[PDB]
Swiss-Prot record:
Family: Belongs to the KEAP1 family.
Quaternary structure, from the entry: Component of the BCR(KEAP1) E3 ubiquitin ligase complex, at least composed of 2 molecules of CUL3, 2 molecules of KEAP1, and RBX1. Interacts with NFE2L2/NRF2; the interaction is direct. Forms a ternary complex with NFE2L2/NRF2 and PGAM5. Interacts with (phosphorylated) SQSTM1/p62; the interaction is direct and inactivates the BCR(KEAP1) complex by sequestering it in inclusion bodies, promoting its degradation. Interacts with NFE2L1. Interacts with BPTF and PTMA. Interacts with MAP1LC3B. Interacts indirectly with ENC1. Interacts with SESN1 and SESN2. Interacts with HSP90AA1 and HSP90AB1.
Domain of life of the source: Eukaryota
Organism: Mus musculus (Mouse)
Protein name: Kelch-like ECH-associated protein 1
Residues with site note (Sensor for electrophilic agents): C116
Annotated Kelch repeat ranges: 9-54, 55-105, 106-152, 153-199, 201-246, 247-293
MF-aspect GO terms: disordered domain specific binding; identical protein binding; RNA polymerase II-specific DNA-binding transcription factor binding; transcription regulator inhibitor activity; ubiquitin-like ligase-substrate adaptor activity
Effect of R62M: Impaired interaction with NFE2L2/NRF2
Subcellular location(s) per record: Cytoplasm; Nucleus
Gene: Keap1
Effect the entry attributes to changing Q212A: Impaired interaction with SQSTM1/p62
Post-translational changes noted in the entry: Non-enzymatic covalent modifications of reactive cysteines by electrophile metabolites inactivate the BCR(KEAP1) complex. Accumulation of fumarate promotes the formation of cysteine S-succination (S-(2-succinyl)cysteine), leading to inactivate the BCR(KEAP1) complex and promote NFE2L2/NRF2 nuclear accumulation and activation. Nitric oxide-dependent 8-Nitro-cGMP formation promotes cysteine guanylation (S-cGMP-cysteine), leading to NFE2L2/NRF2 nuclear accumulation and activation. Degraded via a proteasomal-independent process during selective autophagy: interaction with phosphorylated SQSTM1/p62 sequesters KEAP1 in inclusion bodies, leading to its degradation.
Span within the parent record: 324 to 613 of 624
Effect recorded for R97A: Impaired interaction with SQSTM1/p62. Abolished interaction with SQSTM1/p62
Length: 295
């Protein structure tokens, strides 16, 4: 369903065009409209977004601006009921080009960079305590990593370890606090959009070291294989991604020439992408999540 009373919107927070952005905007698939909402307190690109208990969280990132460039350890929370951002406890370390996933109401922050450091560390946020705690680190240092959750397991996909862009991927098993490699993708991808739909982890787009990608592949956890699906209409890296009522939406990114405003929607029943709207301005490195309409 789409309940609150209210529908669910696709929120895009932050991003990058010439400098890091503070925009918070919300798209409504049911009518095509965009709403501009309360700016982030600090501009940030390379952040991740997620939702827990109806609240939107913005995690990590970096503020690229002429004043200077500052990697972010911030966790900030947006309440659609109040149109207000509130600071939460900060992470143990700044994490630019972070990946995030939610299990059992807990936020996992994965990887990312801090200056020339590439993290394998992972930490977990408990909103009921407003506390972060480190957990087992990944087997691999990963920035520009895509993260998704399927069947209460956390997956970290692709990225960049400081020297090589990665096709590798790994899975975190919470009850054993353990990471294990899974089958690698068929394509090297950093800055891909990663999400979950039905029983598959999707990895769309990204950068393979030479080109921005339009190819899309998905990992069936039952068969442990990756297979390509229809490619997106636009090549893009540093895209935002989310799932809304059974379809995948990809937002913006960089195609090697333009910071895209294109939003594309994947229908898995027909294996086709369509353009569904344009963001109000081209940008990359956004955080995206889905929650109730604001007030
Ligand atoms: O500064 C950035 O966030 C990246 C820009 C790009 O991909 O060209
Ligand atoms: O896990 C929760 O508390 C709810 C998350 C959501 O709003 O989807
Ligand atoms: O591999 C990188 O460093 C960047 C990838 C991207 O543009 O998202």
């Amino acid at each position: 369903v789409p309940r609150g009373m209210v529908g669910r919107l696709i929120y895009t927070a932050g991003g990058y065009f010439r400098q890091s952005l503070s925009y918070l905007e919300a798209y409504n698939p049911s009518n095509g409209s965009w709403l501009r909402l309360a700016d982030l307190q600090v501009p940030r690109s390379g952040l991740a977004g997620c939702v827990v208990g109806g609240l939107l969280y913005a995690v990590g990132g970096r503020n690229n601006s002429p004043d200077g460039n500052t990697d972010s350890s911030a966790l900030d929370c947006y309440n659609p009921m109040t149109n207000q951002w509130s600071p939460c406890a900060s992470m143990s370390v700044p994490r630019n080009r972070i990946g995030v996933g939610v299990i059992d109401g807990h936020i996992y922050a994965v990887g990312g960079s801090h200056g020339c450091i590439h993290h394998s560390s992972v930490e977990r946020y408990e909103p009921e305590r407003d506390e972060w705690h480190l957990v087992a680190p990944m087997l691999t240092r990963r920035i520009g990593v895509g993260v998704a959750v399927l069947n209460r397991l956390l997956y970290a996909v692709g990225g960049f370890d400081g020297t090589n862009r990665l096709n590798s991927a790994e899975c975190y098993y919470p009850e054993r606090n353990e990471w294990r490699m899974i089958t690698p993708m068929n394509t090297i991808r950093s800055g891909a959009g990663v999400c979950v739909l039905h029983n598959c982890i999707y990895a769309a787009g990204g950068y393979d070291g030479q080109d921005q990608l339009n190819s899309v592949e998905r990992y069936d956890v039952e068969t442990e294989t990756w297979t390509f699906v229809a490619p997106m209409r636009h090549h893009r890296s540093a895209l935002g991604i989310t799932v809304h009522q059974g379809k995948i939406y990809v937002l913006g990114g960089y195609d090697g020439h333009t910071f895209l405003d294109s939003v594309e929607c994947y229908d898995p029943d027909s294996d086709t992408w369509s353009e569904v709207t344009r963001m109000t301005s081209g940008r990359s490195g956004v955080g995206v999540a889905v929650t109730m309409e604001p007030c």
